[PDB]
From a paper:
Histidine triad nucleotide-binding proteins (HINTs) exhibit hydrolytic activity toward nucleoside phosphoramidates, such as tryptamine adenosine phosphoramidate (TrpA). While the biologically relevant substrates of HINT1 have not been clearly elucidated, the protein has been implicated in opioid receptor signaling, − regulation of the melanoma-associated transcription factor MITF, , and DNA damage repair. These functions position HINT1 as a potential pharmacological target for treating conditions such as opioid resistance or melanoma.
Our initial screening library included three additional hydroxamic acids with 4-(heteroaryl)-phenyl motifs: KV-24, KV-30, and KV-50, which were proteomically characterized alongside the SW-100 analogs. While these compounds initially appeared to demonstrate excellent selectivity for MBLAC2 over HDAC6, we unexpectedly observed dose-dependent competition of several other proteins in chemoproteomic competition experiments. These compounds also bound to HINT1 and NME4, and, with lower affinity, HINT2 and a protein ambiguously identified as NME1 or NME2. The only reported HINT1-targeting pharmacophores are nucleoside-based nonhydrolyzable substrate analogs, such as the carbamate TrpGC. ,, We evaluated the inhibitory potential of KV-24 and KV-30 in enzyme activity assays using recombinant HINT1. Both compounds effectively inhibited HINT1 activity, with half-maximal inhibitory concentrations (IC50) of 12.3 μM for KV-24 and 12.6 μM for KV-30, which are comparable to the state-of-the-art HINT1 inhibitor TrpGC (IC50 = 9.1 μM). The structures revealed that the aromatic ring systems of KV-24 and KV-30 are buried in a hydrophobic cleft typically occupied by the base of the substrate nucleoside. This finding supports a competitive inhibition mode of action. Additionally, casein kinase 2 family members exhibited reduced binding at two-digit μM concentrations of KV-24. Interestingly, KV-24 showed dose-dependent binding to calcium/calmodulin-dependent 3′,5′-cyclic nucleotide phosphodiesterase 1C (PDE1C), with an affinity of approximately 2 μM. PDE1C is a cAMP/cGMP nucleotide-binding protein that features two divalent metal cation cofactors. The hydroxamic acid moiety of KV-24 might chelate these metal cofactors, supporting the hypothesis that KV-24 binds the active site of PDE1C. Thus, KV-24 and KV-30 should be regarded only as preliminary scaffolds for developing more selective inhibitors.
Numbering used by the authors:
A (entry chain B): 15 to 126
B (entry chain A): 12 to 126
């Protein structure tokens, strides 16, 4: 059940990597919807947040902490929006869990 | 007054009413008063963290717990077709209350971009 995000983690295709550790990867979105638009993904293949396990909690929190640290480092001092999409109604484009982080512009309401 | 005195702190302490979905020792899930989708609820920590930008490293498991509770709640509410989770930070993010909150929206097709 491989995805393009699997290929990015395995370094088989190019991505502009912002941050990496032993358990996650942050990289700029190829189809950016704001001046800054990046993704934070687990290296573990969790297909969708709906199937995340209880013992994934820390890992999921880690994505958010890394995301907020990356945002600060990228100069997003007026704020930002974090997004996780699930399933068809959520508009989940890739069946590998991913945290979007968008900023550098006013984000509007509703959030889609 | 633990929880702070944002509206969310008052909800945690049952000083202001809310439509509560789920509660444990770490968090509270309740319906949003100005819903942007057929289902729209919030998951908040009971610990007052003002915004994600000031979360501590040791808040990781708590932040994770918000998402796990969010996904469980979405399932329990019958959002079978999916949903969108949102955290807003600061002015550009449209953050309305300075107590960290995970929005969970579903029951309709969500569009792109997410605002
Ligand atoms: O000024 C605001 N937004 O721009 C604002 C933000 C939050 C509340 C608010 N949100 C609630 C969400 C869920 C349940 C109860 C809520 N609530 C009660 C009183 C204010 C308020 C009201 C206004």
């Amino acid at each position: 059940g491989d995805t393009i995000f699997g290929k990015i983690i395995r370094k088989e295709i190019p991505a502009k990597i912002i941050f990496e550790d032993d358990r996650c990867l942050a990289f700029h979105d190829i189809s950016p919807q704001a001046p800054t638009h990046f993704l934070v993904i687990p290296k573990k293949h969790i297909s969708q947040i709906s199937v995340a396990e209880d013992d994934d909690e820390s890992l999921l929190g880690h994505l958010m902490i890394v995301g907020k640290k990356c945002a600060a480092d990228l100069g997003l001092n007026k704020g930002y929006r974090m997004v996780v999409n699930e399933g068809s109604d959520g508009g989940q484009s890739v069946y590998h869990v991913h945290l979007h982080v968008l900023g550098g512009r006013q984000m509007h309401w509703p959030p889609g």
